[PDB]
Scaffold this active site. Structure first.
Site, PDB file in Angstrom:
ATOM      1  CG  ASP A 171     -37.845  16.438 -22.706  1.00 18.29           C
ATOM      2  OD1 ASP A 171     -38.583  16.292 -23.720  1.00 18.29           O
ATOM      3  OD2 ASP A 171     -38.073  17.254 -21.792  1.00 18.29           O
ATOM      4  CB  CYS A 208      -0.962  -0.012   1.199  1.00 17.33           C
ATOM      5  SG  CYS A 208      -2.096   1.390   1.312  1.00 17.33           S
ATOM      6  CG  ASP A 231     -36.758  20.589 -20.681  1.00 18.06           C
ATOM      7  OD1 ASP A 231     -36.756  19.380 -21.041  1.00 18.06           O
ATOM      8  OD2 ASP A 231     -37.779  21.337 -20.777  1.00 18.06           O
ATOM      9  CG  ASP A 274       6.471   4.586  -3.230  1.00 17.71           C
ATOM     10  OD1 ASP A 274       5.728   4.765  -4.216  1.00 17.71           O
ATOM     11  OD2 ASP A 274       6.062   4.166  -2.138  1.00 17.71           O
TER      12      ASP A 274
HETATM   13  F1  BEF Z   1     -40.633  17.259 -23.074  1.00 19.84           F
HETATM   14 BE1  BEF Z   1     -39.849  17.928 -21.900  1.00 19.84          BE
HETATM   15  F2  BEF Z   1     -40.687  18.091 -20.627  1.00 19.84           F
HETATM   16  F3  BEF Z   1     -39.347  19.302 -22.396  1.00 19.84           F
HETATM   17 MG   LIG Z   2     -38.420  20.246 -21.044  1.00 14.35          MG
END
Ligand code: BEF
Ligand SMILES: [Mg+2]
Length: 605
Positions: free
Chosen positions: A311, A267, A503, A589
């Site tokens: 999304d 170690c 978002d 080391d």
């Molecule tokens: F479709 Be995400 F809520 F912008």
């Molecule tokens: Mg959104």
């Protein structure tokens, strides 16, 4: 500023080193002390993890290794590895601390408070002092403090933060509108339906911590590494102690010492320094190009994902409309239709009206007149231009037979069309659509270059979904509630680790349900909270640069390791096969460790 607890450990270790060059045997007491005091937080957690089923966790490694040389002579050595560990740890914790509050900066802190209209007069009650049946007023641009039943004639809302809808929603008397966002034009008056902890935002809220009460604990690269390596060396060390007396007849003495020695030398100060180095470096390097990953334990998971769930509204797109199509009636030009529209739409704050006016300007079109401007009728606004009553309204809020087919066409293509109507004649139609982020397209391609498939998970209608998804090369699942994003996400995360990017609020549940959730810098507060990492700037190409960086980090870690422990390997033998000696002899080391510092810095660029 601000914590000196460690500072004592650096100075006790200095005081020890010093008073051993003269007054020797209190120098060794000094080390015993400093070794012990470094050991107390380490050896103790080790025991805790131990009690909770998790042994061989490291703190196990160094507790055992320290306790080893703790008395066989090597104090400073053990003191030193113990010391380095709790330093590198404090480093990494200090990076994650910055990264977190850095995200905490983006939070545009909720103001709370509502404006209840009682006996004809308004009062600024606290949100929680609202009862169903209470009449509440919300001013244009203000979010709802509760689920309300619309009391006013007509009103349009931006509830994209909740539903992922790309376009404002035209609601009428008695319609239900959920808490959190947003009257877009017009002062609305609602009647409260939601009871305190029971608004739309709350209902979504428990799904987050519910998805949390389902999360797998995070095995770090190093707890997972020592899970193997620690019992490895521990098993050999014991056997190098046992075997020689048994056969050979050799002093359990000289093999007790040799065994525990091997355990400790197994170690080095490095490697123990390894994992914090790369993390401190990676997190920092990743932050340079805009991406704030919180804990380094998150960063680790980042260099492990091969799927992405975006999304759309706000994250893949901008959640603001742009004109896509102008179609005049016969005997009119796009420019006339458009300028006539802009004449009525100037002033109006509705995202659509804005998109229109923008269009007139970009095309170098002098907008004129304005007289009345009457935001009533029902999803339509009408003003007086050139002496005439000009109406701009939504889809089927006025007959437009000659335009019907074309309208349908647009609508099926995920387009939202408004009608321009003088007297009672549709002078023409305009089609608008949400806009995707500029670097989106390229970014996706770049992700594919890294072998990262993407899908779209959106609560928006399947037509807008199809449109955007179509511009990109991605599959999509539309019209889906937060729970469905969770369900889809956990269904995917089975196969391979997935990065969720979102978002709004509806993404936050899906965020804690998959490896890592990344929030857009324009993200909602709850999204920024729930996010394991945030993108400032709102640049999608950060994602690529995230994963890239992330993976380098993963590599970098295991480099430091194999240099650290690795050259501890070699001199091992050199000093033990009659060499005995050279540079590296004992010194070779601290020669590692530094390279572990240096290699961890091949992360910046
Ligand atoms: F479709 Be995400 F809520 F912008
Ligand atoms: Mg959104």
């Amino acid at each position: 500023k601000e914590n000196l607890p460690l500072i004592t450990l650096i100075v006790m270790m200095a005081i020890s080193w010093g008073l051993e060059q003269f007054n020797h045997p209190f120098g060794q007491l000094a080390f015993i002390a400093t070794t012990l005091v470094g050991l107390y937080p380490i050896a103790r957690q080790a025991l805790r993890l131990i009690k909770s089923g998790s042994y061989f966790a490291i703190e196990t490694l160094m507790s055992v290794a320290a306790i080893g040389a703790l008395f066989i002579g090597a104090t400073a050595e053990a003191a030193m590895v113990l010391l380095l560990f709790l330093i590198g740890e404090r480093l990494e914790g200090w990076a994650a601390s910055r990264a977190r509050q850095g995200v905490s900066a983006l939070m545009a802190l909720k103001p709370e408070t509502a404006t209840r209209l009682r006996n004809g007069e308004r009062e600024e009650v606290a949100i929680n002092s609202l009862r169903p049946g209470d009449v509440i007023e919300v001013a244009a641009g203000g979010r709802l403090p509760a689920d309300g039943k619309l009391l006013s004639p007509f009103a349009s809302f931006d509830e994209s933060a909740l539903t992922g809808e790309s376009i404002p929603v035209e609601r009428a008397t008695g319609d239900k509108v959920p808490a959190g966002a947003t009257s877009v034009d017009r002062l609305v008056t609602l009647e409260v339906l939601s009871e305190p902890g029971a608004s739309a935002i709350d209902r979504i809220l428990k799904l987050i911590e519910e998805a949390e009460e389902r999360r797998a604990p995070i095995e770090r690269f190093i707890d997972r590494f020592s899970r193997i390596y620690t019992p490895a060396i521990m098993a050999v060390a014991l056997l190098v102690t046992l075997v020689p007396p048994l056969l050979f007849a050799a002093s359990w003495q000289e093999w007790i010492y040799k065994g525990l020695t091997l355990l400790l030398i197994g170690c080095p100060c490095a490697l123990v320094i390894s994992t914090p180095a790369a993390i401190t470096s990676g997190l920092a390097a990743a932050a340079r190009r805009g991406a704030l990953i919180k804990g380094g334990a998150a960063l680790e998971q980042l260099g492990r994902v091969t799927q992405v769930a975006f999304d759309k509204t706000g994250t893949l797109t901008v959640g603001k409309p742009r004109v896509t199509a102008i179609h005049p009636a016969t005997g009119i030009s796009e420019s006339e239709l458009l300028t006539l529209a802009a004449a009525v739409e100037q002033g109006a704050t509705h995202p659509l009206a804005q998109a229109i006016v923008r269009e007139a300007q970009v095309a170098e079109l002098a907008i004129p007149t304005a007289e009345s401007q009457r935001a009533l009728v029902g999803s339509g606004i009408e003003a007086q231009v050139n002496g005439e009553r000009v109406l701009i309204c939504a889809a089927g809020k006025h007959p437009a037979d000659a335009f019907a087919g074309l309208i349908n066409e647009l609508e099926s293509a995920g387009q939202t069309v408004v009608l321009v109507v003088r007297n009672d004649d549709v002078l023409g139609i305009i089609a608008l659509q949400d806009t995707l982020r500029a670097d989106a397209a390229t970014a996706i391609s770049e992700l594919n270059a890294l072998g990262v498939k993407g899908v779209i998970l959106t609560g928006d209608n399947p037509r807008a979904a199809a449109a955007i998804a179509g511009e990109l090369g991605l599959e999509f699942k539309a019209g889906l509630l937060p729970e469905d994003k969770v369900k889809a996400v956990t269904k995917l995360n089975q196969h391979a680790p997935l990065a969720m990017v979102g978002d709004g609020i509806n993404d936050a549940p899906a965020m804690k349900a998959a490896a890592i959730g990344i929030a857009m810098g324009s993200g909602t507060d709850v999204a920024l909270e729930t996010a394991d990492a945030a993108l400032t700037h709102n640049h999608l190409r950060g994602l690529v640069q995230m994963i890239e960086l992330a993976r380098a980090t993963h590599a970098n870690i295991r480099q430091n390791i194999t240099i650290a422990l690795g050259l501890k390997g070699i001199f091992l033998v050199t000093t033990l096969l009659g060499m005995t000696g050279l540079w590296l002899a004992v010194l070779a080391d601290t020669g590692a460790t530094v390279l572990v510092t240096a290699n961890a810095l091949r992360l910046l660029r």
